[PDB]
Amino acid sequence: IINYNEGQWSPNNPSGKKQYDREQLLQLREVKASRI
Amino acid sequence: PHMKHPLMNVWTLWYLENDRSKSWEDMQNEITSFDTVEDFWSLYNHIKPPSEIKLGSDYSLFKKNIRPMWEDAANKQGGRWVITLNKSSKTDLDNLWLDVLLCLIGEAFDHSDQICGAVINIRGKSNKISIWTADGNNEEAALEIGHKLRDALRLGRNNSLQYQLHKDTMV
Ligand SMILES: CN1CN([C@@H]2O[C@H](COP(=O)(O)OP(=O)(O)OP(=O)(O)O)[C@@H](O)[C@H]2O)c2nc(N)[nH]c(=O)c21
């Protein structure tokens, strides 16, 4: 759903660091509000 | 069932409501804990922003098992980066508090192990947003957090960003 960095955590490459930008953290809220 | 994005740490939201009859420790209320970005927003979406909570209340976000107190072992030798805010926009206050929350859960600071939590105080006259640090005697870590704080929050010049040791604040 969002652009992930190389050393950052993700479902694929789940060894990444659990660190998030402001914009990234903002992208993740939107999945609930937008949907019916 | 979609996968949630896990946070580096587990955080707990505290909510304090002033009461002349009660002691400051009894004013505190533990609300909930979370460890994913989605569960953070779910919480944030249903709680009053700082601009709407009663006069004399506090919101605190601290890592799990760290109470927002000087007395807590994690904060004993620590301090806090205090941001004092004159009577300003409600939107500006809520946005500033949210940005602090996002810095914390996002692990914006290099010395993540140095971060204990953040506290916002609503006092009408002047609102204060503080970020509690583990080791106040280490100027290196304190200042690193200070610059990241000035930058990330985009803090304006002549906005008071001051550090205080908890030992001194007790006076
Ligand atoms: C963080 N605090 C704050 N506090 C009580 O709350 C008072 C501080 O009020 P605040 O919560 O600092 O907001 P403010 O009213 O702005 O502080 P001041 O008015 O001293 O500037 C202290 O006088 C103290 O009695 C505390 N009392 C105990 N025992 N432990 C703590 O960790 C804290």
UniProtKB/TrEMBL annotation, chain A:
Belongs to the eukaryotic initiation factor 4G family. This is Eukaryotic translation initiation factor 4G1, isoform A. The gene is eIF4G1. The chain holds residues 602 to 637 of 1666 of the full protein.
